[PDB]
Amino acid sequence: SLWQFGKMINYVMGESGVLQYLSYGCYCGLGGQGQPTDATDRCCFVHDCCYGKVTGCDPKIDSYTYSKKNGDVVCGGDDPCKKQICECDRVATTCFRDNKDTYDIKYWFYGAKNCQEKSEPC
């Protein structure tokens, strides 16, 4: 669920994590349109394409199973649909950490009026 994705972002990125990633560029948030702005916005484009392959369960409200091992997050459980949602969430938090050196404040709370070009294929 989105409550679990928020707890995962603060463990990997620090105390101000959720406020820094809730709205950035043309793709960071639920849904999106147009073309990506930089490397950080591209991590969120891949996350939307991953949620689109899920059939039978809901990514906003359904709960999955996970554990923490000395800094490393690992997915578990026995339902195939719920485990698929946990893997989409784990891969995006590692992409945010690898690209921290190019994050730019001119793109935080950007707007939809600047995302009006022909949309990029998955």
Ligand X SMILES: *CC(=O)c1ccc(Br)cc1
Q: Which residues are catalytic?
A: 47, 89
Q: Any contact of residue 112 with a second copy (CB under 8 A)?
A: yes
d(C-alpha 83, C-alpha 100), whole Å: 27
| Contact by Cβ (8 Å): 88, 50 | yes
Q: Any contact of residue 19 with a second copy (CB under 8 A)?
A: yes
d(C-alpha 25, C-alpha 108), whole Å: 7
79 Cβ contact partners less than 8 Å away, ≥ 6 residues apart: 57
Q: What is the CA radius of gyration of the chain?
A: 15
Of ligand X, a second copy, none, which one does residue 62 interact with (CB within 5 to 8 Å by kind)?
none
For binding to ligand X (CB under 6 A), which residues are involved?
Answer: 21-22, 28-30, 44, 47-48, 92
Apex 45 CA angle, 83 and 106, nearest 5? 130
Of ligand X, a second copy, none, which one does residue 111 interact with (CB within 5 to 8 Å by kind)?
a second copy
Q: Which is nearer to a second copy, 100 or 113 (CB)?
A: 113
What are the residues binding a second copy (CB under 8 A)?
2-3, 6, 16, 18-19, 22-23, 29-31, 60-61, 105, 108-109, 111-113
